[PDB]
Structure 1
Amino acid sequence: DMDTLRERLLAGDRAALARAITLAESRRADHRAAVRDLIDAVLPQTGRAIRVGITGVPGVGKSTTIDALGSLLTAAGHKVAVLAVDPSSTRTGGSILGDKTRMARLAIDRNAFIRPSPSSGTLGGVAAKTRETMLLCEAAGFDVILVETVGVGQSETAVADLTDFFLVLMLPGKKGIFELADMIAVNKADDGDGERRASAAASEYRAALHILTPPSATWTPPVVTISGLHGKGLDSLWSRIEDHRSKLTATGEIAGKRREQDVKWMWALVHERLHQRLVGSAEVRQATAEAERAVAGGEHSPAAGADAIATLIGL
């Protein structure tokens, strides 16, 4: 019953939230429709959260840093969602149980809620389904939404376009990442000597970033040092994110960014549906893959590809 699902979701019921999400992430069109009204209906309870995107190479203490940061926040009374975006999920069907235990503490904290990357046809669709899932979390009372890049593909721009603040975690020992960053945090600044060489590296990143013009005069990206493993610097790291929130709330820039992202996700969903017509049948898929291949092979022009494809999919 969707009325009950809604009410219990609004009441903060973890099982109702998990179930609404399942339907919103579904690759069945009938399921997705079913919960469109529900998300729309609870939209006025969304948005009262800090959305942070977090990235860094595999091997930088990302999951560790998240487990620790998230635990600090649940201890102080926050309810924290951790959602993944993984471009490989455009080729897998998604994951039933995901990989919760990379974050040992959060994985068992009922003040947390951890979800793996949804499946969809395009990266745009994966990210858009993630926005819808963020809205459900918020409506169920999660006030911190962490969205992390997982895998090796290009998810950084999408994660940044899903959140208010984009956090880059770096080691002390992809170009585009720097200009997405609202803050860099040099990790593994261990009390024993790691602090010296991460403080060095932070001066290098801090020096270089002076040459980039930030998108707003309201905020100048800082570079900091932390230890994710021993919990160092995590409190001040969070206080900078809070400070960003207060400043860009006062100027209306948090809201203006979100409005722009939302329209972007709307168009991404329109384009996902179009893409779904490419796999409408084997014949349509064959012919459209060969149009694309022709263009990618240099054999016919982009415009000829485009018209072949447009005819095939009824456009």
Structure 2
Amino acid sequence: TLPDMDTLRERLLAGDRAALARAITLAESRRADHRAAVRDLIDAVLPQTGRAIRVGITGVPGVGKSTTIDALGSLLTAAGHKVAVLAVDPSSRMARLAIDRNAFIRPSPSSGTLGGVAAKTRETMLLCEAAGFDVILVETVQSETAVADLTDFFLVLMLPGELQGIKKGIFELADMIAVNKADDGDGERRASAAASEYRAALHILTPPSATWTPPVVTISGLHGKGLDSLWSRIEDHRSKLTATGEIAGKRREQDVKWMWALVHERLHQRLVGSAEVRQATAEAERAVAGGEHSPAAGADAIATLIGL
């Protein structure tokens, strides 16, 4: 009734890409035993995970994120890395990387809650690491904090110059800002001028006791400029924060966060699993949003629905 998960596990650990893809396919099937088998497989290969650089990447639409990931991912595969690109979308391109046999690109997983989407992304990351991927890029497509809380290093891409340049509260979380579109000629001057502004703000906000002082750099994703320097900074961070234990410390905190997120996703699934409860939950939420009932009145109405 179930597939041969022992043999799938062995093939995956031996680097068989078909096995990695199949494990991810089984995790998104409608059968609960398929999903449980892949859960059990991930748990079984946990000791072979973690040996990767996990980089989160965000930026406003049009900044050049797809292009930059495509270019950076190709630079890394050329250099002997195996690169996974995982998207995170609460609503749940890269064409050259898409044909690269050492890259593995996946869209955002489906879940009831953004916590669930993000936590499923952690589980996919672990699968990828067990399968031998040593670079995990997680991109936003809210999702920004989730992606920072999924990765070791948070890279924010910015335009080289009346809206938010990036969502309020996200700039200060950057481990590096890369100002994109530093194209030959004036593009370089402009982006470098913009980098000087972001660099002033970020260094005002960075205490000298911080282990890592976030750099601000200029790049051209389109023309492949500045990407080696960018990556070298991520590797420097890995070395420095591995030395302090701060990468382990952050991962432990993230993993507990995603565990609780999945417990909350299980709760959410119980609340939308039947029409009555789904409607009653909606009504309570509407009453609170509308100022008709207090937040605790809505909460207790919902908690009683499922005997909590």
Normalising by the smaller structure, the TM-score range is over 0.9
Q: Alignment length, in residue pairs?
A: 298
Q: In the aligned structure 1, how far is the partner of 2:75 from the partner of 2:230?
A: 12
Q: Deviations over 1:216-240 (max 9, x none)?
A: 7210111000011110000000000
Q: 1:215 to 1:279 in 2, by over 3 A?
A: farther
Q: Deviations over 1:150-171 (max 9, x none)?
A: xxxx200000000000000000
Retained in 2: the 8 A contact 1:181–1:221?
Answer: yes
Give the Å deviation of 1:26: 4.1
Q: In the aligned structure 1, how far is the partner of 2:8 from the partner of 2:208?
A: 40
Retained in 2: the 8 A contact 1:53–1:160?
Answer: yes
Give the Å deviation of 1:24: 2.7
Q: Deviations over 1:170-220 (max 9, x none)?
A: 001x12111221000000001121000110000000001122136972101
Give the Å deviation of 1:27: 5.4
Normalised to the residue count of structure 2, the TM-score between the two structures is 0.95
Indicate whether 1:292 and 2:285 are aligned.
yes
Retained in 2: the 8 A contact 1:218–1:248?
Answer: yes
Q: 1:42 to 1:214 in 2, by over 3 A?
A: farther
Q: SS at 2:50's partner residue?
A: coil
Q: 1:253 to 1:26 in 2, by over 3 A?
A: farther
Normalised to the residue count of structure 1, the TM-score between the two structures is 0.92
How many percent identity over aligned positions?
100
Q: In the alignment, which residue of structure 1 is the partner of 2:153?
A: 165
Aligned pair partner of 2:18 in 15, 20, 25: 15
Give the Å deviation of 1:117: 0.4
Give the Å deviation of 1:22: 1.9
Give the Å deviation of 1:63: 0.6
Retained in 2: the 8 A contact 1:51–1:165?
Answer: yes
The more displaced of 24-33 and 265-274 is: 24-33
Q: 1:248 to 1:2 in 2, by over 3 A?
A: same
Give the Å deviation of 1:259: 0.2
Q: Deviations over 1:110-149 (max 9, x none)?
A: 1000000000000000000000000000000000000000
Q: 1:45 to 1:13 in 2, by over 3 A?
A: same
Give the Å deviation of 1:278: 1.0
Retained in 2: the 8 A contact 1:278–1:285?
Answer: yes
Structure 1 residue runs of 5 or longer lacking an equivalent are 90-101
Q: In the aligned structure 2, how far is the partner of 1:262 from the partner of 1:25?
A: 21
Q: In the aligned structure 1, how far is the partner of 2:285 from the partner of 2:31?
A: 26
Q: In the aligned structure 2, how far is the partner of 1:214 from the partner of 1:79?
A: 35
Q: 1:179 to 1:215 in 2, by over 3 A?
A: farther
Q: In the aligned structure 2, how far is the partner of 1:30 from the partner of 1:232?
A: 47
Q: In the alignment, which residue of structure 2 is the partner of 1:135?
A: 126
Q: SS at 2:222's partner residue?
A: coil
Q: In the aligned structure 2, how far is the partner of 1:129 from the partner of 1:268?
A: 10
Give the Å deviation of 1:25: 3.7
Retained in 2: the 8 A contact 1:25–1:129?
Answer: no
Q: In the aligned structure 2, how far is the partner of 1:76 from the partner of 1:294?
A: 56
Q: Deviations over 1:258-302 (max 9, x none)?
A: 000000000000000000011121011111110111111101111
Retained in 2: the 8 A contact 1:127–1:159?
Answer: yes
Q: 1:161 to 1:106 in 2, by over 3 A?
A: same
Q: In the aligned structure 1, how far is the partner of 2:44 from the partner of 2:209?
A: 33
Retained in 2: the 8 A contact 1:27–1:119?
Answer: no
